Amino acid sequence: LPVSMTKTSVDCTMYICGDSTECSNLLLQYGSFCTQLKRALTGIAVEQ
Amino acid sequence: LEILDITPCSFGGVSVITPGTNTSNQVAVLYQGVNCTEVSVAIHADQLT
Numbered sequence: 001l002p003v004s005m006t007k008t009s010v011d012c013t014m015y016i017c018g019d020s021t022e023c024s025n026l027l028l029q030y031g032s033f034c035t036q037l038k039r040a041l042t043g044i045a046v047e048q
Numbered sequence: 049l050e051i052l053d054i055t056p057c058s059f060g061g062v063s064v065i066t067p068g069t070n071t072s073n074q075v076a077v078l079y080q081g082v083n084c085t086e087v088s089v090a091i092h093a094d095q096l097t
């Protein structure tokens with residue numbers, strides 16, 4: 001019986017816009033879309 | 049005409065440890081998945097974002 005999976009901590013800016021200030025700025029125009037993803041990944045780690 | 053690699057500059061994560069601010073104000077920091085002999089020289093170079 002499996003008990004847990006590998007815990008992941010993907011990051012919005014580093015994954016999408018690697019060290020690009022303009023790209024990060026245009027990501028900020030998307031609102032808090034990805035803070036949800038960070039919170040959900042923290043959650044999945046916590047449940048593991 | 050030689051071969052050079054390319055690696056991540058320092059992609060990791062920062063987690064802050066802290067009791068309730070109603071209790072104290074001291075804070076201890078984490079640096080996720082990075083040998084921090086590398087950040088110890090990094091703070092010396094002040095290259096830490």
Ligand SMILES: *[C@@H]1O[C@H](CO)[C@@H](O)[C@H](O)[C@H]1NC(C)=O
Pocket residue numbers: 083084085086
């Ligand atoms: C990470 O740990 C120490 C401290 O830096 C050193 O042996 C070396 O940098 C790394 N060791 C391994 C086994 O990756």
